[PDB]
Amino acid sequence: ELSGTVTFWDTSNEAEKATYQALAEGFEKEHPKVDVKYVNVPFGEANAKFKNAAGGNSGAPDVMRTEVAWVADFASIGYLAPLDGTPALDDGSDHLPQAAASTRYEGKTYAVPQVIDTLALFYNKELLTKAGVEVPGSVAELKTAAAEITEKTGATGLYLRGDDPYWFLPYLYGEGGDLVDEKNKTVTVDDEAGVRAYRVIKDLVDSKAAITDASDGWNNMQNAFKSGKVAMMVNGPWAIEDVKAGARFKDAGNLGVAPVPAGSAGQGSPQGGWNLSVYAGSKNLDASYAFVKYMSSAKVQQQTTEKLSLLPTRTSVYEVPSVADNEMVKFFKPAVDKAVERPWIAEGNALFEPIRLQMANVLSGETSPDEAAANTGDAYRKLLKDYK
Ligand SMILES: C[C@H]1O[C@H](O[C@H]2[C@H](O)[C@@H](O)[C@@H](O[C@H]3[C@H](O)[C@@H](O)[C@@H](O)O[C@@H]3CO)O[C@@H]2CO)[C@H](O)[C@@H](O)[C@@H]1N[C@H]1C=C(CO)[C@@H](O)[C@H](O)[C@H]1O
Numbered sequence: 274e275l276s277g278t279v280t281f282w283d284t285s286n287e288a289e290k291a292t293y294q295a296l297a298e299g300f301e302k303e304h305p306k307v308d309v310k311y312v313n314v315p316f317g318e319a320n321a322k323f324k325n326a327a328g329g330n331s332g333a334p335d336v337m338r339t340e341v342a343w344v345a346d347f348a349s350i351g352y353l354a355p356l357d358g359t360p361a362l363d364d365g366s367d368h369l370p371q372a373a374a375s376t377r378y379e380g381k382t383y384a385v386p387q388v389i390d391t392l393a394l395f396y397n398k399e400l401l402t403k404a405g406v407e408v409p410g411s412v413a414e415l416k417t418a419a420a421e422i423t424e425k426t427g428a429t430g431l432y433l434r435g436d437d438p439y440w441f442l443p444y445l446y447g448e449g450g451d452l453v454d455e456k457n458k459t460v461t462v463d464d465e466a467g468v469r470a471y472r473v474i475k476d477l478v479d480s481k482a483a484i485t486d487a488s489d490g491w492n493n494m495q496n497a498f499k500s501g502k503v504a505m506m507v508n509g510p511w512a513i514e515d516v517k518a519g520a521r522f523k524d525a526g527n528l529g530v531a532p533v534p535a536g537s538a539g540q541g542s543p544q545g546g547w548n549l550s551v552y553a554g555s556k557n558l559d560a561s562y563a564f565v566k567y568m569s570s571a572k573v574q575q576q577t578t579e580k581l582s583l584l585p586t587r588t589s590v591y592e593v594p595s596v597a598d599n600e601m602v603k604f605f606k607p608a609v610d611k612a613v614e615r616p617w618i619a620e621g622n623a624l625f626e627p628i629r630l631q632m633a634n635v636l637s638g639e640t641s642p643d644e645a646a647a648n649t650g651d652a653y654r655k656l657l658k659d660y661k
Contacts, residue, residue, distance in 0.1 A: 276306035277557040279564045282323065282334035284316045284547070288515035292580045300567050307560050320346070320622075327352040330554050335561040336568075339384050339550040341375035342615075342622035347550065348378040349619035354551040354558065356382045361551065361562040364587075367571070371614050372586040376548055378617070384548035385569040386586030388577065390509045391542045391612040392443055393605065396529040397521070400426055400504040411535040412447065412473055415505070419482035422504045432494045432503040433477055435485035435636045438628035440507060442543040444470040446613055447536020452624055453653065455616040458660045462628075463650025466538065471635045471642035473536060478636060487633055507533055509545065513582040513601050530604050544612035546586070578602060584609060620656050627652030 279300070285293045294311045301309055312334065314322055320343055326333035327347070339347065347353050356362055362385065365373070372386035396408055404422040409415035419430020434440040445451065450466025453459065461467075477483040484503065486493040498506045499519035508516075513528075522528045533542045549568055551561045567573060574585040575593055582601040590596050591606065615621055627649045634640035640648070654660060 274306070275304045275560045275563055277560050278308050278310055279336060279557055279560045280310040280312065280334045281336045281338075281564065282312050282314045282319065283338045284314055284319045284340070285338070286316070286511055286515065288518065289511060289581055289583070292577070296568065296573055296576060297564075299573075300564055303567075304560070304563070307564075309564070316340075323347065324350075324352070327552060327554065333552045333554060335552055335555045335557055336564050337550050337552060338387065339548045340622070341544075341546050341548060341617075344375055344384045344548055344550065345378045345617050345619045346622055348381075348383040352553055353383040354553045354555065354561075356385065356551070356562070356565075359562045360559070361385055361565040363566050363570070364589075367587040367589050369586055369588060369609075371544055371612075372546065372548075374614065375546070375617055378619075384550040385565050387547045387549050387569055387574075388510070388583040389544065389546040389586050389609050390511065390584060391544055391605065391609045392440070392507050392509050392533055393542065393608055394505055394531045394533050395498065395508050395512070395516070396505045396531065397428075397498070397501065397503075398527050398529045400428055400501065401529070404504070408529060408531045409505075409534055410532075411540075412444075412477070412537075415534050416477070416480060416482045419480075419504075423481065426504070428501055429481065429484050429497075429503045430505055431477060431483035432497040432506040433474060433483035433485045434490045434494050434507065435474075435478075435633065436487055436490035436629070438625040438632060439543065439545070441470065441474070441628050441632050442613070443507060443533040443541065444473050444536060446541025446543075447534065447539065448473065449536070449538030451613070453616060453657070453660060458657075460650050460653040460657065460660050462653060463646045465646075467646035467649060468642045469537065471632070471645045474632065475635050475638075475642065485636055487637065510581075510583050510601065510605055514580075525600075530601065532608060541613045542608060542611070544609065544614050546584075618657075623656055624653060627656075 376384040404425045406418040448466040448469040631645040
């Protein structure tokens with residue numbers, strides 16, 4: 274017997290949310306005495322909304338779609354139910370290891386993996402063909418390509434998202450850098466790779482290879498890509514269905530995807546994704562654990578991919594012929610296997626804010642790449658007291 278209310282806060286976007294609400298309410302098929310109360314909470318509001326509710330014990334959800342960085346964030350302040358030895362964990366070993374690391378805090382499991390992701394370079398196949406160019410493998414080749422795309426088609430080569438710090442990471446990795454050396458507790462973002470990365474992004478916009486905006490970046494990016502204003506953008510699996518809604522990409526066929534470009538030293542893209550957690554103060558714990566088990570089951574992960582092309586965390590699901598043949602999946606899974614894994618620390622998501630501010634000021638010309646990198650590092654040393 275399961276019964277009662279299970280309130281689920283989902284952060285999925287406008288293209289994803291009808292699918293996730295249907296999946297959530299499908300828990301009631303097998304458990305008709307449970308009432309699933311689906312709520313969609315915008316991504317940028319959800320961390321604060323959950324903390325406010327959990328800290329007040331007031332209108333907190335039973336189950337929270339928890340970003341990979343949010344697990345240690347929320348768990349560090351006691352807001353998540355530990356899951357070890359509960360029915361929430363079924364076939365745990367099925368999950369990709371890097372997925373499983375984000376679920377852990379101080380030797381306890383506080384979430385179950387849902388989707389895994391990384392950033393990639395999406396491109397308009399027809400524009401590149403019309404421009405006579407190949408999909409660029411590096412920043413250097415992207416600049417050459419962008420000039421041909423402007424000269425032959427009038428589009429801009431790249432929409433470079435300028436208001437979300439996560440988009441700095443491919444450039445950092447491509448210049449040979451990283452945020453921190455975790456094993457050695459050393460801040461590394463202000464090494465010369467960080468200077469070079471800020472410089473590359475500024476050059477892409479100044480040279481007119483790319484355009485950007487200081488606000489409303491998600492909408493501006495998607496609108497520029499879908500309208501053919503740009504030929505390329507960096508984005509993740511959560512954009513696929515949104516892009517395919519557009520006249521230009523109905524023909525799933527016109528939507529190309531490739532790795533983010535290499536920089537002067539190498540290439541990399543960050544690992545991201547979503548897990549599912551239970552609020553520590555839930556008044557319907559059995560029903561919530563079962564709900565988490567259901568939402569993370571192989572069946573529901575397979576359905577998510579079939580409807581949205583989001584990537585499963587469960588290895589078995591890749592073997593299901595239907596997942597094994599989705600062309601967005603066949604590209605993204607190897608890219609995810611290569612993606613760079615961050616420190617899963619309480620302060621992890623706070624590492625993004627200094628990048629946000631310094632990247633904005635580099636793009637507007639208020640701050641040099643040199644000063645931006647040093648400022649980022651200074652902010653990290655303040656955030657991480659036992660880092661040098
Ligand atoms: C800045 C943000 O970057 C990283 O998060 C990325 C997620 O891992 C991706 O999955 C993707 O999230 C989208 C979901 O897939 C989608 O279903 C829907 O929820 O919309 C999401 C946004 O489009 O993209 C994210 C990057 O945009 C990183 O891992 C994450 O921790 C970072 N978030 C921090 C930054 C801010 C504000 O700058 C806060 O709002 C967050 O609470 C922080 O955690």
